[PDB]
Amino acid sequence: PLKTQQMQVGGMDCTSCKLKIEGSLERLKGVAEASVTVATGRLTVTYDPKQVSEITIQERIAALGYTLAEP
């Protein structure tokens, strides 16, 4: 019922950066799964297309000074 998706990413480290994505999204809306692929500069999400979707990750990546490219 929620669709799974991965983007490309401009600067997600692990050490203090995987965290700074993932544990905001839980407190965000419209997304209900996620996980990083730092080993390719990528982020995976699974989102429920009822309200907010890519937005959730745009707010979150831009609120850290980084760039995203979701297909």
Curated annotation (Swiss-Prot):
Gene that this sequence comes from: ziaA
Binding site for Zn(2+): C14, C17
Source organism, top-level taxon: Bacteria
Subcellular location: Cell membrane
Record protein name field: Zinc-transporting ATPase
Ranges of the Cytoplasmic topological domain: 1-71
Domain HMA residues, every copy: 3-69
Protein family membership: Belongs to the cation transport ATPase (P-type) (TC 3.A.3) family. Type IB subfamily.
